[PDB]
Amino acid sequence: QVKLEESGGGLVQAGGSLRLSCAASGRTYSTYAMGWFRQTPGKERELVAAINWSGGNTHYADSVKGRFTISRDNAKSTVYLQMNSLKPEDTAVYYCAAPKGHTGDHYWGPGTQVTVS
């Protein structure tokens, strides 16, 4: 099965920026769409941003539009989430995800803490 490897994140002051990365490990020109969900205590995971296999189509949650940008290094099967103008409400665990076929279910990375002070 596809393995998703995450890096980035950490603690940042409000107004600051972080850049998350997720790689479909060992894959070259992977055909998986990739993106991030985030989760806070007591709530379900919520889709933040996603990008298709080619990098030509993206999706953003309304709450992050104009602040977060998802991009893709297609050869390296790696996506990046540039998180600018961070707000306290952005504090969450961010999980990389790829679709399980066409089913609407997902493969998951391990999760990355983003904490905005």
Numbering used by the authors: 1 to 117
Pull verbatim passages from the article behind this deposition.
The variable domain of these Camelidae antibodies can be cloned, resulting in the smallest known functional antigen-binding unit—the VHH (also called nanobodies, single domain antibodies, or sdAb). VHH antibody fragments are small (13–15 kDa), heat stable, readily produced in E. coli and display distinct antigen-binding properties compared to traditional antibody fragments. The VHH R419 was originally isolated from a pre-immune phage display library to bind the Listeria surface antigen Internalin B. VHH R419 was later found to be non-functional as it was unable to bind InlB or inhibit Listeria invasion in vitro. Here we report the structure and biophysical characterization of VHH R419 for its potential future value in homology modeling of other more therapeutically relevant VHH.
